[PDB]
Amino acid sequence: EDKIKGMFNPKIWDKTFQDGLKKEIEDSQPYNWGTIHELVNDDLLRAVRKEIETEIHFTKKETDIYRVNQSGDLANLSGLDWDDLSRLPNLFKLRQILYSKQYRDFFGYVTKAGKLSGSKTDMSINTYTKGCHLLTHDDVIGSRRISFILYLPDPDRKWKSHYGGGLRLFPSILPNVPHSDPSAKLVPQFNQIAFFKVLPGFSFHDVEEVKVDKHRLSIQGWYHIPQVGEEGYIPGELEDFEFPKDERNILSFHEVKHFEKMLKVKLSEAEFTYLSQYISPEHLSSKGIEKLQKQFVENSSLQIESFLNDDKSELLKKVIKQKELEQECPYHSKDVKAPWKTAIPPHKARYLYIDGKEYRNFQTEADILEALNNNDLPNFQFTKDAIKIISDASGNSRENNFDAELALIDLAVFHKSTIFKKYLALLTSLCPVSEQILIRRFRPGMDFTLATKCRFNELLKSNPDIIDAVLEGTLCLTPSAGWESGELGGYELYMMDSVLINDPPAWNTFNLVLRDESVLEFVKYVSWSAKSSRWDVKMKWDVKSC
Ligand SMILES: O=C(O)CNC(=O)C(=O)O
Ligand SMILES: [Mn+2]
Numbered sequence: 227e228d229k230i231k232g233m234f235n236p237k238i239w240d241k242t243f244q245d246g247l248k249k250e251i252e253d254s255q256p257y258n259w260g261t262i263h264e265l266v267n268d269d270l271l272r273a274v275r276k277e278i279e280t281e282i283h284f285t286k287k288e289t290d291i292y293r294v295n296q297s298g299d300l301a302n303l304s305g306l307d308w309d310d311l312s313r314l315p316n317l318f319k320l321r322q323i324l325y326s327k328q329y330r331d332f333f334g335y336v337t338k339a340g341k342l343s344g345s346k347t348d349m350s351i352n353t354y355t356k357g358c359h360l361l362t363h364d365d366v367i368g369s370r371r372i373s374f375i376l377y378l379p380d381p382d383r384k385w386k387s388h389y390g391g392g393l394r395l396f397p398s399i400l401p402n403v404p405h406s407d408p409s410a411k412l413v414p415q416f417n418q419i420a421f422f423k424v425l426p427g428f429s430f431h432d433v434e435e436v437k438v439d440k441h442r443l444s445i446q447g448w449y450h451i452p453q454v455g456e457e458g459y460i461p462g463e464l465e466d467f468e469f470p471k472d473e474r475n476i477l478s479f480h481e482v483k484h485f486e487k488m489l490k491v492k493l494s495e496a497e498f499t500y501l502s503q504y505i506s507p508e509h510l511s512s513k514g515i516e517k518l519q520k521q522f523v524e525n526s527s528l529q530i531e532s533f534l535n536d537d538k539s540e541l542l543k544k545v546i547k548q549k550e551l552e553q554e555c556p557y558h559s560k561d562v563k564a565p566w567k568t569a570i571p572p573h574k575a576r577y578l579y580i581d582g583k584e585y586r587n588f589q590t591e592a593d594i595l596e597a598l599n600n601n602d603l604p605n606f607q608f609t610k611d612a613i614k615i616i617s618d619a620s621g622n623s624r625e626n627n628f629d630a631e632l633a634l635i636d637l638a639v640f641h642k643s644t645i646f647k648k649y650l651a652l653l654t655s656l657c658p659v660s661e662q663i664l665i666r667r668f669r670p671g672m673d674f675t676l677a678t679k680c681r682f683n684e685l686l687k688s689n690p691d692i693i694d695a696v697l698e699g700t701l702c703l704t705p706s707a708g709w710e711s712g713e714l715g716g717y718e719l720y721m722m723d724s725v726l727i728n729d730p731p732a733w734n735t736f737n738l739v740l741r742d743e744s745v746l747e748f749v750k751y752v753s754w755s756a757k758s759s760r761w762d763v764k765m766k767w768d769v770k771s772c
Contacts, residue, residue, distance in 0.1 A: 230326050233267045233319070238332055248336040256397030256409050257429055259422035260336065263415070265376065266320070271417050273316035275378045278443065281313050282306060284353050288712075290677040290719070290748045292360040295353040306351065321347055324376075324447070327457070333449070339372050339423050341459050342449040349447035354391055357713060357753055358442075359435035361674060362396060362404065362572040365424045365448075372449040373429070374421035377414035379442055387413050390437035390754070393420050395430075396572060400591045402427035403467045406559045406572045414442070424448075430573055435671055435754050467594060469570050470581050472681035474660035474766055475603060481644050485657035488648060489772035491515050497645050504640045505649075506535045518653050526740040527726065528653070533701060533736035542637070543705050543733065545629040550705075550758050552624050555669060560589060564616065565609050565631055566667075569675075577673040577749075580631065580665040582606040582638070604663070606635050606642065634665045634763070637701075641765060654738075656697060656769035659686075664764040668716060671754030677721070678748065680741040683768055691770045696741045699765035704731035706758035715750040716760040722746070731760040740769075 237243045251260040265271075283304040284295040297306040311318040323329060325344045334342045346369070354360075365373045375393070379385045394408035411434065412420055422429055436442055452459035465471075491512055493501070501510055508514050509530060522528055534542070549555075559568040562578060564585040569577045582604030586597050613628045613635075620626045640646060647658050660683065668674070680696035700718055709716055709730035718737065720727040723744040727737060741747070752760055 230323050230328050233270060233323050234329065235262075235264050235266070238262070238265075244332065244336060248338070251336055252338070256395055257422065257425055258337070259395065259420070259429075261412065261421070262419050264417050265419045266323075266417055268381075268417060270316055270320065271376075271378060272381060274314075274320050275381065275416075275443065277314045277316055278351055278378070282351060288750075290674070290750065291363070293358050293751075294360060295355060295358060297351045308347070308349070320445075321349060324349075324374075330449070333372070333421075337372055337421070337423055339449070341452050341457065342371060343369075343452045343456060345453055345456060346450040347447075348450060349445055352444055352446065354433060354436045354442040354444075356436055356439045357755070358433075359751060360433035361676070361751060362430050362432045364427065364429045364573065365431070366426050366429070369451040370424045370448045371451050372421060372423050374419055374447050374449070375414075376445040376447070377416060377418045377420075377443070378445065379414065379416055379440070381416040385413060385415055385440075385442070388437065389440050389442075390435050391440075391442040392434040394432050394434055396432070398428055398430075399571075399588065399594065400467075402464055403571050403594070404428075404430035404573060405589070406568050406570050406576055408432070414444070432572075435751075437671075437754050466598060467571060468574060469567065469586070469588070469597075470579060470662075470664060472662075472766075474662040474683065474768055476660045476768075477647075477658060481647060482657060482659055484644060484648060485651040486772050489651060489655060489657065491652065493645075493648065493652065497648065500643070500645045501649050502535065504534055504538050504637070506532050508532065515652065519655070522654050522738070528736070528738040529727065529729065530736040530738075531732075532734055534734050538637070539734050542633050542703055545633045546703060546761055547705055548624075548627075549630040553626070555759070557669065557672065559587065562587060565613055565628075565635075575673075575675040577675065578667040578669065580609070580635065580638075582609050582635075582663075606639050610635050631665075634703075634761075637763060638663050638665060641701075641763065647767075650767075651772075654697070654740075654769075655772070656693065656740075657772050658697065658767040658769055659692065660768040662764075662766045666749075666760075666762050666764055668749060668752045668760040670752050670756040670759065672752070673749075673759075674715070674751035675748045677719070677746040679723070679744065679746060680766075682743070686768060689770075693740075693769050693771060694743060695769065697767040697769045698739050698741055698747070699763075699767075700737045701763040701765070702729070702732055702735045702737070703761040703763070704758060705733050705761075706731075706756070708757055712750075714753040714756040716752045716756060717750050718747070719750060720745060720747050731762075 282297050287296045299305045330342045393412040395410040396404035397409045399405050556562045565580045566578050569575045617628045686692045716731040718729045
């Protein structure tokens with residue numbers, strides 16, 4: 227109770243230091259946070275790190291939102307018991323002082339956070355190694371009031387920026403709508419502490435993938451609202467911003483009646499000729515269709531390899547490989563030009579896409595609000611029009627050309643066709659009544675989606691003929707190697723609310739799934755070390771039975 231303050235850098239007890247830091251936090255951007263260098267008695271934090279290395283057993287865990295080496299899974303034996311620190315006397319001593327009344331009075335003062343629990347200790351020990359990463363979130367959970375992270379990388383070697391592993395902070399386009407791109411990045415050093423008041427809809431942050439083979443050791447923790455009466459405490463003393471929307475447009479009367487008349491290999495020579503512009507002969511033949519109809523009835527899932535025929539396989543691979551290798555892919559949302567859009571918000575997803583709508587770039591509230599007041603629909607042929615006219619001005623350089631976008635839009639127009647939707651209904655024996663089609667590109671080190679359910683159309687809920695499901699399709703057009711372990715991410719993951727599908731990115735595949743209310747999907751975050759983007763074509767349809 228006396229030697230506590232002495233286990234800190236004496237500067238934090240200095241009134242001048244305190245009042246100076248308080249203001250630094252008040253006026254910080256993009257939301258109120260702060261950092262202190264050399265927080266703790268160096269020989270202690272050195273003792274603590276030698277303890278963690280000696281005694282604690284880290285276990286990789288990957289989910290949609292992170293990959294991190296964890297020590298916290300209790301009910302795994304290796305799980306760290308904070309109720310038993312017999313062999314981590316210096317860690318015990320660390321927790322004691324971070325939650326001391328001495329430190330809490332300081333730390334609460336500078337952060338204008340009010341009272342902070344000393345009895346509700348809440349700490350965890352993680353390492354991030356090559357590939358590890360934690361996507362965007364605001365920390366808003368239960369009674370967390372202030373977040374803090376104490377860094378213990380190798381104390382005798384400075385952590386470098388190109389290592390990755392940075393604390394990134396996202397600014398607010400408007401509340402619960404953080405800008406896709408981070409506006410500040412903290413390269414952590416030993417005995418450094420990052421911290422912020424937990425703020426619903428604002429404190430969005432992440433941990434940049436660790437790119438090299440080093441060990442980023444941290445102690446994340448939280449200060450909580452006091453227990454009721456603790457040191458005198460008394461209590462009390464959006465889908466509209468998601469882009470793309472998970473919406474489909476109903477099909478014409480022409481289209482639907484076709485799929486009905488058919489279901490109540492009945493395609494013409496002509497229709498088969500159309501379908502074979504794009505689809506491999508192997509999936510147009512009688513045997514090949516019975517083979518797929520059977521699969522679908524059994525699994526309510528198709529996973530087709532070599533979907534497209536070789537003419538279109540060679541074409542797409544070429545133009546996709548050309549763009550990968552000879553053009554500057556944009557790595558900030560401001561840089562994305564027509565026909566591409568950046569999916570937002572980053573605590574839900576981040577990827578590049580073509581939706582055939584008029585061009586949006588969302589840097590401001592007014593950008594989001596201008597689009598909401600002016601909802602507009604896809605038109606791919608007009609999108610092609612727009613591109614050629616831009617692509618004539620500049621000149622179709624090895625570096626500036628739109629060949630990929632044009633081949634892919636052509637592929638989307640195929641899949642938009644009446645006839646494909648006939649072929650589809652033939653495969654599945656379902657009548658599509660709606661569609662949404664997207665071209666998606668997931669960039670190394672930036673793009674991901676997160677585990678979500680399908681979204682039923684509210685207007686068609688009361689319809690007995692429409693299946694309480696969503697038919698979802700994914701044509702993957704990723705031409706690079708090394709995805710196969712999951713290690714690079716990019717994989718399409720279908721699981722239940724146990725895993726239905728787990729397909730790393732591959733070339734010219736087509737997955738097809740009928741999702742009921744409860745199925746979760748996500749494309750995993752793509753590693754910085756991936757050798758290309760994941761390219762694909764996402765297709766969603768409401769369906770009805772015939
Ligand atoms: O280690 C870091 O810098 C960030 N950690 C977190 O944001 C978290 O654990 O929720
Ligand atoms: Mn966090």
